[PDB]
């Protein structure tokens, strides 16, 4: 979580309830990306980045 969920919305408290972003990141295997592009319906031949 230290390196995947990131949310400096200038949130000034512990449950980050005053936040408005909270962008999280996924790392996944090839087969995982195919199955992910399956669920959320996406071009499996795109290949993402971050």
């Amino acid at each position: 979580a230290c390196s995947h969920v990131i949310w400096d919305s200038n949130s000034k408290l512990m449950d980050k309830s005053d936040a408005r972003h909270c962008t999280v990141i996924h790392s996944m295997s090839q087969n995982g990306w195919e199955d992910f592009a399956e669920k959320y319906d996406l071009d499996a031949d795109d290949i993402p980045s971050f």
């Binding site: 295997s29 090839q30 087969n31 031949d45």
Partner: protein, 47 residues
């Protein structure tokens, strides 16, 4: 890509996963040794 060759699919999902059944497995089965077989490793005939 598209390549519905079944074995190429199944094998190319094991091969891909055995790259973790590496870094870790390498260690893990190695503990089943400092306890299970013997606490010395990789010479097996010294004087």
């Amino acid at each position: 890509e598209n390549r519905l060759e079944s074995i190429l699919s199944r094998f190319d999902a094991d091969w891909t996963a055995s790259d973790e059944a590496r870094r870790e497995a390498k260690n893990d089965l190695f503990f089943s040794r400092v306890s299970q077989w013997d606490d010395w490793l990789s010479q097996y005939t010294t004087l």
